[PDB]
Amino acid sequence: RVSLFPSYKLKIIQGNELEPRAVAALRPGMTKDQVLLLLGSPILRDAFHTDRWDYTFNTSRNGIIKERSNLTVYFENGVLVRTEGDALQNAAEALRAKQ
Amino acid sequence: AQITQDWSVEKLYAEAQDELNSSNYTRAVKLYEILESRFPTSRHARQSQLDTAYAYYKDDEKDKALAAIERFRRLHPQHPNMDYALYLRGLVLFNEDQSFLNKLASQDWSDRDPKANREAYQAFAELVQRFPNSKYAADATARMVKLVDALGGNEMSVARYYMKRGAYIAAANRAKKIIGSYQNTRYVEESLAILELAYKKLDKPQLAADTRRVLETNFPKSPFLTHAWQPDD
Amino acid sequence: DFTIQDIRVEGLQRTEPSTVFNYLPVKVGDTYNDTHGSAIIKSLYATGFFDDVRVETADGQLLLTVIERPTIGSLNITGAKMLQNDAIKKNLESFGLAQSQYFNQATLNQAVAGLKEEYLGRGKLNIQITPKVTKLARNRVDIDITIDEGKSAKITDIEFEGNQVYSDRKLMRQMSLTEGGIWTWLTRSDRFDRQKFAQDMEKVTDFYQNNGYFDFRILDTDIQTNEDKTRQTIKITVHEGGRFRWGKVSIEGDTNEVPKAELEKLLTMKPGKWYERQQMTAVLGEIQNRMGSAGYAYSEISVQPLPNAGTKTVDFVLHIEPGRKIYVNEIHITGNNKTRDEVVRRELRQMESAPYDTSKLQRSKERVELLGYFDNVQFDAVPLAGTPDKVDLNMSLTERSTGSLDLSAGWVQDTGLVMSAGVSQDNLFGTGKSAALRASRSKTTLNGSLSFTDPYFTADGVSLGYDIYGKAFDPRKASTSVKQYKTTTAGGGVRMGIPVTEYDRVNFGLAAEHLTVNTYNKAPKRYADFIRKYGKTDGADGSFKGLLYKGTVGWGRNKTDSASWPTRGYLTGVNAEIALPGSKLQYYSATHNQTWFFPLSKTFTLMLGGEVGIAGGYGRTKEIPFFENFYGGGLGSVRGYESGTLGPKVYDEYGEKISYGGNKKANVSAELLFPMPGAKDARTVRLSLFADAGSVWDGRTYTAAENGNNKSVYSENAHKSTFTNELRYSAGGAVTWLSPLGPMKFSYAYPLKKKPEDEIQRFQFQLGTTF
Amino acid sequence: YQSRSHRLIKLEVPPDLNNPDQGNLYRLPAGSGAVRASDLEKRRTPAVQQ
């Protein structure tokens, strides 16, 4: 298995996707059910940091992560307080470019 | 039906059991129902209802075995030999796969399926709950713990296969499932390590630090602290 | 009110009163005035135990008078003519009435009604059903079924109405139902069936609407029987609506991720041809398959026609409304006995947690089925309790036996007895890791083989393996005196595959073979030179020994719908055996293969054969060794004259005839393959007619021989066997039987352009494997 | 080399981590403490008079 050969045929893998326009609809002070219905179910949510709904994406090809874009959102008292991640920027750029 | 000869129920049962001993099943089942059709009011009828399911278990087919064992379950719900029914159902539904062509004495049991294993575990749980003290209960508990270990092994194998492909986003979820719903098994101090590796491979330092802290406070001496995880084989 | 105190029941024979005691939802010490007075009889009537029970209240001991339920001791079956008695017994047991089964009369009535309706659905109209009841011992009863079938129900006339636009003859010739004639008595091509008539109605409405006539309002169906209800006459009335021209298809709606232009390009259509409705169904399926790869599984598409009379046209708008992008939370696998779980996870696409894409799931299902381990494979889609965005893809497996023992024999037209033995295994109770042993033996051939491969060497895929063979060949045998030379080979070699794309997959092969050739008493011209240039003589004979370090590049794809009885699809392959220098006998040989199929009829199918092969000389040796030459002519090649008689022919000692063979092969084949339409469509025998040429060439010319030339002209250019593009025509029927005890190939072919030297064999047969 | 060797340990957790208990599945009370057993070929019952 060592010293792999240049067999140029490798399956592409993905991790999650999110709609760009719906990202702009996010507003601070949002409840859990409404944000889940509006943006989508998070594909990665640990049980060690309950409040940390995450969304990622990685077109992988033999370990080498080609492209990625992650979006996080933090909750407390059952209401949205703040978000972060490079997804907001690229989402805004794509919304300004397409529309 | 070709002989249909009058006899005594005792010699019918003797002929039936000695044909069973001679690895005769196709002709046995056809000579099993004849005695209960001719003599329904007899304990030999119930003995036939049991050993026909036993013989069906001795062969590869299982649907007829399940049908017969359910027939007995619904027919005599209070016979003292009810313990044999549940145990036979558990062994049939476990898919023992009794064949010397594929003995493989190791048989880690992490390959058969989740379906039959789960149903056999449920059957043995019903058995141990019904008869907590019978002629055989410790064997039931041993097979039950072996089956839950096999389920844990299947989950761990599915988790491991994804880590060799790059889909860390899936190994993370599968390891989280194993951590949160598969205690009492042996795959605990490895699921944490593979989850840490998956979190680190996706540029999430806080998650990796937290899960590594949990690992080190739950296992002070483990090779996964110094050496990062590495898929074997 | 009343309190139960150990109620006693009476009136049973074999029901074990303890059981019926346990089935009572009440026991000792319960207050019961009238609450469960009917609950007891409802619970007892359920599960099929009795039919009449009486319960009262009297001095703490209720008198329970019960009568038992009859028991079906044994089922009797007879009278089945159109169907089989075992089949009717099985689909009657599907309704119960197995051994003593607490028989009930209502179940018997329901079963006889169902089977009567089923028989009436067939070409049977007036059928007598007489199930008889008899009183055997204490509770055993026996039921016998007697079916009185008529001859058949043939159709007399098939006619339509309102057919102002189409001729009725083409109608009746287009339906899948004909009228009585001279060639219609066979196969019973005039029976009446409900499902067959429904399928015929669907066929005729598809025929009408594909041609460009729209809305096809089918008024009513008029069946008309005869006296005694034996003959049937059908009457159909329809209504057309004139042709149209649909050319203004359009798409509107939300397409959050998929671009509108990409779907618009997929909306293939033209205002010509009036229309083709099957094309509309196809483009709808295509737009549902495209939207559904980006991750829109539940995308429902609507269509509404905008009809415009006068100009006779209708336009289409498509109000697509997708939503709720669907992921894959978890994909289970069931029925995976005897095989590892990773061997299935390693092949299927749609890895995990990714958007749900049908265009990938279909390839997944096709990939898993192409493994040979499993027979039936499905891909369900069950939602989860977190219904937004989450589904599951629990698989379903039907484990088929893989390992077996191979031991077969056959018969060839010239040599005769051939053997074949060796254990086979497709799964060494683990991953793929297929290992196989094989050793065959004939009166002239012998070649053992031990094979062991490994489908997945690396993580993605590399078919690596090893093998060892001891092939030996010697034609010093019966009347067909092929050129005399004994050959024996031995040695192994690593074979390695390397997929380049999802569909095509090349495979490289290196091998180190040891070879020894042995001649016989005085040899022809093309043998003594070789044995004195490379071999060593031993008295009146000689031999040679060496090594055959060689490589192999190959590539082969196949997309036929079945191994036997083929359809649309085509086999193709490329092969090349190159003897890498370093050892003696530097030669290389390429090969080609093409067997294009064509299903231009529901029964008649076509095949377009073809192959090309060149064996050039390079390196040290300028010529090519004869034992690695090509042998033109034979059953699979030309289907005509005897094998090994193509190419140049020279004379040897005792005035005999042999054939060397040349290194420029090609042949084109073409048949007309169809089964026997005499009895039925039994998938057992297929028939054809052979029509194929051949070719083999060396380039040189032959004039010097054993004092005699077997060619007419003194200076026959051996570069071809005949005029440009050397060939030998042939034609004749081909009979094929495909019983599991080896295939039967009976090919009788009449020769064409029969030269006065090509040994002919107009009748050729094959039996067994003879690989 | 201190990999798993059938060491049953309940997942402890530091505070501020929201322990991932969620209950355990496929209960292993094994009736009591997961004891072992042996074989006797108990796949048939004669029950002639007993």
Side-chain angles (χ1 to χ4, degrees), chain A residues 2-99, chain B residues 1-134 136-233, chain C residues 1-26 28-139 141-190 192-228 230-482 484-601 603-689 691-696 698-718 720-761 763-771, chain D residues 1-35 37-50:
Chain A
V2 70
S3 168
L4 275 79
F5 303 95
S7 85
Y8 198 80
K9 177 49 196 171
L10 309 102
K11 312 188 283 286
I12 286 299
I13 303 94
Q14 310 85 342
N16 184 14
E17 214 276 338
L18 82 168
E19 203 279 329
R21 168 176 56 251
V23 176
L26 286 184
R27 290 300 176 274
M30 184 56 63
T31 186
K32 225 168 191 176
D33 205 48
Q34 281 181 354
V35 68
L36 175 135
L37 171 64
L38 173 62
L39 184 80
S41 158
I43 201 56
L44 183 139
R45 167 177 46 182
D46 67 337
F48 292 114
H49 264 244
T50 161
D51 314 300
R52 214 186 181 279
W53 291 12
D54 289 347
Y55 314 85
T56 45
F57 175 60
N58 50 2
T59 294
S60 74
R61 184 181 292 168
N62 192 22
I64 302 181
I65 309 302
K66 182 175 179 58
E67 62 185 32
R68 74 167 62 88
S69 88
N70 63 327
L71 175 54
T72 50
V73 51
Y74 287 73
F75 286 154
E76 72 176 7
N77 310 88
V79 58
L80 164 58
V81 306
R82 67 181 183 93
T83 185
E84 65 92 12
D86 64 80
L88 290 96
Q89 201 58 30
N90 53 65
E93 306 324 298
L95 171 139
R96 289 157 63 256
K98 169 186 171 186
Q99 290 284 346
Chain B
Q2 294 297 325
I3 181 65
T4 71
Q5 181 55 230
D6 200 319
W7 281 310
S8 295
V9 309
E10 300 92 351
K11 73 177 72 176
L12 312 172
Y13 169 74
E15 172 72 20
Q17 68 94 30
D18 261 7
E19 278 201 359
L20 162 68
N21 295 134
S22 46
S23 78
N24 171 266
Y25 302 108
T26 317
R27 282 186 172 181
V29 56
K30 96 176 187 178
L31 299 154
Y32 286 166
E33 96 287 350
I34 175 179
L35 61 89
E36 55 83 20
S37 316
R38 278 187 165 182
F39 313 97
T41 299
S42 159
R43 318 180 178 179
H44 299 79
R46 302 182 274 287
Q47 217 66 29
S48 199
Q49 289 279 353
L50 303 191
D51 77 329
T52 179
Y54 167 51
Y56 272 114
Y57 154 70
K58 266 292 171 293
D59 289 357
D60 60 356
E61 72 272 355
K62 74 164 188 176
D63 313 328
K64 314 186 71 61
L66 265 297
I69 197 66
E70 184 277 348
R71 170 185 310 277
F72 173 74
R73 286 269 309 278
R74 200 184 70 258
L75 174 70
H76 313 299
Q78 285 301 119
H79 193 268
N81 215 359
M82 190 75 154
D83 51 339
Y84 186 83
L86 296 189
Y87 190 75
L88 176 47
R89 162 193 175 94
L91 269 68
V92 177
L93 193 52
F94 164 76
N95 264 327
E96 176 75 21
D97 198 77
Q98 174 58 41
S99 314
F100 196 53
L101 184 136
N102 54 327
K103 188 258 289 181
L104 180 55
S106 46
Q107 213 60 31
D108 187 281
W109 272 336
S110 196
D111 61 347
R112 314 293 191 89
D113 62 313
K115 180 69 176 181
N117 290 335
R118 177 187 299 104
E119 305 265 29
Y121 165 80
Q122 168 67 24
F124 280 115
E126 178 179 346
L127 180 140
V128 60
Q129 212 280 334
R130 188 75 63 93
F131 296 150
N133 50 3
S134 90
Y136 44 101
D139 186 286
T141 75
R143 279 186 175 269
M144 176 161 53
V145 60
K146 286 299 291 298
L147 263 294
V148 73
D149 172 74
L151 286 187
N154 177 217
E155 291 294 331
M156 173 52 60
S157 158
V158 167
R160 269 204 302 259
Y161 162 71
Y162 280 160
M163 274 299 306
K164 286 201 295 295
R165 307 302 318 282
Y168 314 130
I169 199 62
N173 262 336
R174 182 72 83 180
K176 194 258 293 184
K177 170 189 298 182
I178 295 182
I179 281 168
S181 315
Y182 263 65
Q183 283 85 13
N184 319 110
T185 42
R186 66 196 304 185
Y187 317 95
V188 170
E189 67 180 2
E190 184 183 335
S191 284
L192 275 167
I194 70 178
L195 182 65
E196 177 264 353
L197 183 51
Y199 280 164
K200 174 181 171 298
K201 267 280 189 176
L202 285 182
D203 303 328
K204 296 188 184 303
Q206 297 85 354
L207 268 299
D210 296 327
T211 182
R212 181 175 166 272
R213 184 192 312 176
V214 170
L215 173 59
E216 66 90 20
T217 182
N218 279 13
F219 298 98
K221 296 186 64 62
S222 178
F224 293 130
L225 274 297
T226 65
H227 296 170
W229 190 80
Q230 158 68 39
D232 214 325
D233 181 28
Chain C
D1 203 278
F2 169 77
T3 299
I4 292 88
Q5 296 106 7
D6 198 6
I7 301 319
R8 314 304 306 176
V9 298
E10 306 291 335
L12 70 90
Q13 289 180 341
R14 44 140 287 184
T15 78
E16 294 184 25
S18 44
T19 76
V20 60
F21 277 155
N22 187 278
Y23 287 109
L24 317 182
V26 288
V28 61
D30 184 29
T31 43
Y32 152 67
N33 49 336
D34 207 28
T35 318
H36 64 76
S38 199
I40 314 302
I41 196 67
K42 284 177 183 180
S43 45
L44 179 150
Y45 277 174
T47 76
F49 264 94
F50 305 103
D51 47 351
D52 190 329
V53 179
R54 277 301 315 120
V55 57
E56 293 88 4
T57 310
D59 58 275
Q61 297 293 319
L62 321 187
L63 274 297
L64 266 298
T65 43
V66 66
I67 193 164
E68 279 198 2
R69 161 147 292 183
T71 75
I72 170 64
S74 44
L75 178 63
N76 315 335
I77 52 173
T78 181
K81 325 293 292 184
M82 191 178 181
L83 319 182
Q84 304 88 0
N85 272 302
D86 45 20
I88 200 154
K89 181 168 63 177
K90 293 316 284 181
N91 55 13
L92 196 166
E93 290 306 322
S94 62
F95 298 153
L97 315 177
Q99 307 311 294
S100 165
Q101 274 303 110
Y102 283 87
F103 153 78
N104 180 28
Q105 199 72 41
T107 42
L108 175 47
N109 296 127
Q110 191 267 349
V112 306
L115 62 93
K116 192 261 177 182
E117 184 279 339
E118 165 61 36
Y119 265 77
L120 189 54
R122 313 296 186 91
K124 302 306 177 181
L125 276 294
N126 311 330
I127 308 307
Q128 290 283 340
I129 182 66
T130 59
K132 289 304 296 175
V133 175
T134 187
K135 192 55 199 68
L136 306 96
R138 284 82 52 184
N139 263 264
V141 304
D142 269 1
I143 298 313
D144 187 0
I145 172 155
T146 55
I147 300 312
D148 304 358
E149 295 185 15
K151 50 179 73 175
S152 278
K154 42 179 174 295
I155 314 298
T156 77
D157 192 331
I158 301 176
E159 73 280 16
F160 291 89
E161 283 181 354
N163 323 119
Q164 192 263 323
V165 305
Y166 275 89
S167 88
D168 291 335
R169 174 65 181 268
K170 182 180 56 54
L171 270 64
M172 48 195 96
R173 294 314 293 260
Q174 198 270 346
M175 305 170 81
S176 158
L177 190 60
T178 175
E179 310 171 16
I182 55 171
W183 62 72
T184 79
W185 298 356
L186 54 91
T187 50
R188 202 179 307 272
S189 44
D190 216 343
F192 178 55
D193 188 12
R194 318 291 299 277
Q195 290 79 6
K196 201 170 191 298
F197 198 89
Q199 293 178 28
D200 203 299
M201 194 61 54
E202 316 282 19
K203 280 187 53 55
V204 59
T205 181
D206 273 308
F207 181 82
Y208 277 3
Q209 196 164 2
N210 285 320
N211 288 141
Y213 290 89
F214 193 50
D215 315 283
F216 187 29
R217 276 318 169 195
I218 302 110
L219 260 60
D220 188 285
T221 314
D222 308 331
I223 57 176
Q224 281 300 137
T225 174
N226 78 314
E227 184 56 87
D228 192 281
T230 53
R231 317 270 69 81
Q232 175 64 218
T233 295
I234 192 56
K235 188 65 208 66
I236 308 293
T237 193
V238 304
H239 185 272
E240 295 91 324
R243 74 165 190 81
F244 294 87
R245 272 174 172 177
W246 328 352
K248 307 304 294 176
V249 286
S250 60
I251 297 179
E252 290 178 350
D254 215 358
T255 71
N256 315 272
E257 191 201 7
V258 191
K260 314 171 184 179
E262 182 176 354
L263 305 189
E264 209 277 340
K265 296 161 191 175
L266 195 57
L267 194 60
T268 193
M269 206 58 249
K270 58 191 300 294
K273 320 302 179 176
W274 307 306
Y275 213 65
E276 213 282 339
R277 198 210 65 171
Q278 186 264 348
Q279 187 75 19
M280 162 52 56
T281 297
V283 60
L284 200 72
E286 208 62 40
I287 197 64
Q288 192 80 353
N289 182 272
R290 175 57 185 83
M291 177 165 296
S293 315
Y296 295 91
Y298 297 155
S299 90
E300 173 60 271
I301 176 168
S302 158
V303 56
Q304 43 170 7
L306 319 181
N308 189 11
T311 172
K312 317 305 292 180
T313 189
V314 58
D315 304 334
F316 282 164
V317 295
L318 295 180
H319 192 48
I320 303 184
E321 188 84 356
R324 307 315 304 169
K325 172 175 284 292
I326 284 307
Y327 302 143
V328 176
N329 188 21
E330 211 53 55
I331 167 160
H332 308 145
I333 284 179
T334 58
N336 209 50
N337 190 23
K338 196 49 205 306
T339 184
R340 278 294 152 87
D341 192 285
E342 194 193 326
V343 74
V344 191
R345 293 299 192 93
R346 214 164 56 248
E347 297 188 347
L348 87 168
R349 301 302 189 268
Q350 184 51 269
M351 194 57 58
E352 203 84 16
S353 308
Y356 176 87
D357 50 356
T358 310
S359 89
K360 196 182 278 182
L361 193 71
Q362 201 276 339
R363 177 54 189 174
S364 193
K365 190 224 296 184
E366 191 184 23
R367 179 70 179 271
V368 177
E369 203 179 49
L370 271 186
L371 196 50
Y373 291 168
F374 318 119
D375 284 330
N376 188 205
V377 158
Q378 294 92 330
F379 273 95
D380 305 358
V382 51
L384 198 142
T387 301
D389 297 332
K390 291 293 184 59
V391 308
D392 271 354
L393 296 182
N394 43 2
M395 214 178 171
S396 66
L397 275 301
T398 55
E399 172 73 22
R400 165 168 57 97
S401 66
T402 62
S404 158
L405 175 56
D406 262 358
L407 172 63
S408 158
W411 190 272
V412 70
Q413 197 172 4
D414 59 347
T415 309
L417 73 162
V418 301
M419 307 312 123
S420 78
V423 307
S424 198
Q425 182 55 263
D426 262 7
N427 174 17
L428 290 175
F429 51 85
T431 309
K433 297 190 185 309
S434 197
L437 190 70
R438 181 163 181 83
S440 75
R441 179 181 183 271
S442 89
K443 222 172 180 60
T444 177
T445 80
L446 187 139
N447 49 4
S449 44
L450 185 145
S451 285
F452 152 74
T453 180
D454 202 313
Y456 286 77
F457 192 66
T458 178
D460 199 300
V462 162
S463 54
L464 192 141
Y466 322 94
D467 53 355
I468 283 287
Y469 38 78
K471 166 187 173 302
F473 179 75
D474 190 14
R476 181 54 170 270
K477 275 317 291 171
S479 78
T480 169
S481 189
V482 171
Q484 298 314 304
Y485 63 99
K486 194 176 75 65
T487 59
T488 316
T489 42
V494 169
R495 41 183 303 274
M496 169 184 305
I498 168 166
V500 288
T501 183
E502 59 158 4
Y503 290 165
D504 304 334
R505 176 174 179 167
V506 299
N507 51 332
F508 303 150
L510 188 137
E513 299 178 353
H514 180 268
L515 157 73
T516 184
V517 67
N518 177 34
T519 55
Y520 278 153
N521 194 267
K522 52 190 76 61
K525 169 66 170 55
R526 264 283 310 279
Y527 280 20
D529 59 338
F530 161 74
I531 198 167
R532 73 183 150 91
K533 191 178 186 299
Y534 295 106
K536 184 259 290 181
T537 180
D538 311 323
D541 209 354
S543 279
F544 157 78
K545 293 167 55 182
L547 300 186
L548 266 300
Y549 297 157
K550 62 173 62 179
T552 291
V553 171
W555 167 66
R557 55 189 301 169
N558 177 27
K559 283 191 299 300
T560 182
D561 305 318
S562 279
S564 315
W565 291 59
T567 43
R568 160 71 191 186
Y570 64 102
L571 289 84
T572 318
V574 180
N575 288 317
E577 179 187 16
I578 303 179
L580 204 166
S583 180
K584 275 80 70 177
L585 280 76
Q586 209 282 337
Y587 59 84
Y588 71 102
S589 57
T591 297
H592 209 282
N593 201 12
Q594 277 180 355
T595 51
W596 269 339
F597 276 86
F598 273 133
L600 283 181
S601 158
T603 299
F604 309 140
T605 190
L606 202 81
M607 54 159 54
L608 197 145
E611 76 183 4
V612 168
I614 306 101
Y618 207 75
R620 177 200 305 189
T621 302
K622 187 57 67 178
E623 292 180 340
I624 290 298
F626 50 88
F627 46 84
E628 199 97 340
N629 198 307
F630 287 99
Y631 284 167
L635 169 66
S637 76
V638 303
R639 206 83 61 82
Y641 41 85
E642 200 175 20
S643 89
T645 78
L646 263 186
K649 271 85 64 176
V650 306
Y651 279 160
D652 54 290
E653 199 189 16
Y654 305 111
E656 303 172 355
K657 191 198 311 180
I658 64 174
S659 44
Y660 301 140
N663 55 6
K664 286 205 306 294
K665 81 180 300 182
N667 69 322
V668 181
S669 171
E671 308 173 21
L672 182 44
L673 166 54
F674 57 94
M676 167 255 302
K680 68 173 188 301
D681 59 357
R683 307 308 177 102
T684 315
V685 287
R686 275 169 93 97
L687 311 95
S688 301
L689 60 89
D692 40 17
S695 69
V696 56
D698 64 343
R700 295 174 293 176
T701 177
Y702 283 168
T703 305
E706 198 79 13
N707 303 124
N709 278 322
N710 213 17
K711 314 305 278 285
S712 78
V713 70
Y714 168 77
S715 45
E716 193 271 340
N717 186 22
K720 297 182 293 297
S721 61
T722 176
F723 291 87
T724 53
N725 195 36
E726 65 283 6
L727 70 88
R728 298 284 193 281
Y729 296 113
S730 171
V735 176
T736 53
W737 185 10
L738 311 95
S739 91
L741 274 297
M744 286 56 67
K745 291 177 56 60
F746 286 172
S747 86
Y748 176 79
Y750 204 68
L752 284 178
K753 202 47 189 175
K754 185 261 290 180
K755 300 301 295 301
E757 72 278 3
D758 298 0
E759 309 175 13
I760 189 53
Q761 174 63 242
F763 183 75
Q764 297 175 337
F765 79 106
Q766 192 184 68
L767 271 192
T769 81
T770 196
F771 192 28
Chain D
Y1 172 62
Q2 200 44 42
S3 303
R4 74 279 190 190
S5 278
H6 315 85
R7 188 77 56 86
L8 272 56
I9 284 296
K10 175 154 290 186
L11 280 165
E12 209 184 342
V13 68
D16 193 84
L17 265 299
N18 300 118
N19 60 327
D21 203 340
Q22 273 195 348
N24 45 4
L25 201 56
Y26 301 94
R27 303 177 180 88
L28 191 48
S32 58
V35 308
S38 198
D39 54 39
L40 188 53
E41 289 288 81
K42 324 182 68 61
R43 305 169 188 175
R44 54 197 66 88
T45 310
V48 286
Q49 285 90 34
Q50 297 86 2

